[PDB]
């Protein structure tokens, strides 16, 4: 807010006596705004309680190592069909979930043939769902240039641009990501993992160079390796109903007293 809002006027308390309430009053004169209450948050006019300042802590810092950890987590969760379904993408007719296409796609330059490619890959139901989900935003976002809202469509990861962005920029919901500049803000909208991504063959080949393997460090990071697992076999039922554990157990007591 203006740092001088509500402090323009000259005003002072009438004091005790006068049968008024010791708040500052506007100095005299034959107007409505006269002896009326000027300073303080409770008055009509005057400042507010704590005038918001511009030097609030607006930006936050996070460690690079866990930036990379989260981006790896998002990529890992993007390749499990149940998680994409839970996120809501229509992928019931996708051939294989880590959907990778030929490098010739990177040379497209027409939105019509981009749409044809989506039709062939059977990912068009998601764009139709985005179309169905376009509507007006509720509240005072209307009059602040955020009038219209819609749903996130599938993302497309490319290695080198040769018109792929020109082709896919016009289709709603589609976002384009260079493989070497991945970001969590677009690979996990709303903080939720499992966005439906369509890869290009070159980008898919280059991904393990970017992030390294379990035994090989990243080739184009300064010093980065994949994060370790706290537990390797996460399937709990298989562990529990195994002969080794079933052997060293007492008999269950499931009779209710």
């Amino acid at each position: 807010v203006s740092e001088l809002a509500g402090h323009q006027t000259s005003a002072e308390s009438w004091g005790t006596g006068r049968a008024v309430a010791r708040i500052p009053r506007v100095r005299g004169g034959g107007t409505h705004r006269s002896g009326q209450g000027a300073f303080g948050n409770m008055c009509r006019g005057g400042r507010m309680f704590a005038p918001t300042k511009t030097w609030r802590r607006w930006h936050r810092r996070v460690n690079t190592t866990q930036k990379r950890y989260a981006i790896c987590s998002a990529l890992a969760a993007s390749a499990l069909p149940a998680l994409v379904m839970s996120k809501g993408h229509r992928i019931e007719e996708v051939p294989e979930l880590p959907l990778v296409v030929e490098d010739k796609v990177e040379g497209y330059k027409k939105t019509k043939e981009a749409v044809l490619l989506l039709k062939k890959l059977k990912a068009w139901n998601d764009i139709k769902k985005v179309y169905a989900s376009q509507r007006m935003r509720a509240g005072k976002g209307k009059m602040r240039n955020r009038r219209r809202i819609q749903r996130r469509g599938p993302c497309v990861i490319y290695n080198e641009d040769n018109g792929i962005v020109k082709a896919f920029r016009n289709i709603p919901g589609i976002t384009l990501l260079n493989v070497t500049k991945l970001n969590i803000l677009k690979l996990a909208p709303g903080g939720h993992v499992g966005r439906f991504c369509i890869w290009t063959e070159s980008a898919f080949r280059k991904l393990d160079d970017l992030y390294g393997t379990w035994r090989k460090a990243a080739s184009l990071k300064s010093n980065y390796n994949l994060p370790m697992h706290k537990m390797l076999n996460t399937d709990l039922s298989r562990i529990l109903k195994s002969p080794e554990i079933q052997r060293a157990l007492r008999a269950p007591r499931k009779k209710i007293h």
Binding site: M143, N145, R147, R169
Partner: protein, 134 residues
């Protein structure tokens, strides 16, 4: 999506620049589509309205197929008056009803040197655009 860093997507700015436009901008804003045969023969899609163009009303209470000649283009209210779109006042005077030019299709233009110049310029620009596209 708009990419020019010098034009506004700002709602209030657009409404201000529309409701406080000068007359020579009002003229461009008040444009109407040409009919099918006219657009096919002139290779032009839209055209600003003039005082003596014959038109059809497409939307509203008066939508129909009859032809009406514009009688005046009142650009301060962004309206035009067609000579048989009118209603009856309480006393008995007949009064025109204003129709926005965008809900009106032109069936016969009036042509002079400036009109022909504008039509040929628009047609040439469209043709070179198609040639560049193909």
């Amino acid at each position: 999506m708009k990419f020019n860093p010098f034009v506004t997507s700002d709602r209030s700015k657009n409404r201000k620049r529309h409701f406080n436009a000068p007359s020579h901008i009002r003229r461009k804003i008040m444009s109407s589509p040409l009919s099918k045969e006219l657009r096919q023969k002139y290779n032009v899609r839209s055209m600003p309205i003039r005082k003596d163009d014959e038109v059809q009303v497409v939307r509203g209470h008066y939508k129909g197929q009859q032809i009406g000649k514009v009688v005046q283009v009142y650009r301060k209210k962004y309206v035009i008056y067609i000579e048989r779109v009118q209603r009856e006042k309480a006393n008995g005077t007949t009064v025109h009803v204003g129709i926005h030019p965008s809900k009106v299709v032109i069936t016969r233009l009036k042509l002079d040197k400036d009109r022909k110049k504008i039509l040929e310029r628009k047609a040439k620009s469209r043709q070179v655009g198609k040639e560049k596209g193909k």
